[PDB]
Amino acid sequence: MGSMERASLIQKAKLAEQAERYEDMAAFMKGAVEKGEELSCEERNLLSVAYKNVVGGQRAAWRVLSSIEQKSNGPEVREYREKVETELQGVCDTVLGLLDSHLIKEAGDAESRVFYLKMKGDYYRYLAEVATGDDKKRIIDSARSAYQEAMDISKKEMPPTNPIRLGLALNFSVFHYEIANSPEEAISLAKTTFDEAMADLHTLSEDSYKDSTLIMQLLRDNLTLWT
């Protein structure tokens, strides 16, 4: 997207979101990142929403095909699962490439740095979901390390009700439960996150209260499923 203006790429990403054209959205936001300027709060959300939708569809397809494949155990089901898996890995690698070149190194404010590091943890988590061979352990540790650095910053620099801090803790708890085989750590993190947010709600406006309690309900839903 080298010949399109940055502002036009951002405008078209918003249009693609309205049209539910998430592959286009992701390509426009990739082009915007590659302009080399830092991203605003809204622009970071557009980047994240675009790729979450793209990889979300790939993950859902991979799970369907992996399930069919396990029930069978010709080459077609494995071959097609492999094709989807490779395409998913390519999207995760693309996002991780954008974070590494050069979103994270230029992110100095807590809100941007925690956001990008949460993203890094998430896309390594998606790689871990399909990983088997020599690198599954290294991929898991890469997810854990990104999430941990984001946690450390968010606990130092953000209030316990901050939605980015809450969504980070939510996803790190899912990482513990689903990827790291640490359900007790998952439950403990979700509980402590919920309780510390509840005690901070009194400081918030009506709109901020709505933002934070929405994500706290997601923590509660997981705890209900896990206990």
Binding site: K52, G167, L170, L218, N222, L225
Partner: peptide, 9 residues
Amino acid sequence: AGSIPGRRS
């Protein structure tokens, strides 16, 4: 187990 949906801007 739900992660952040994160599908809507």
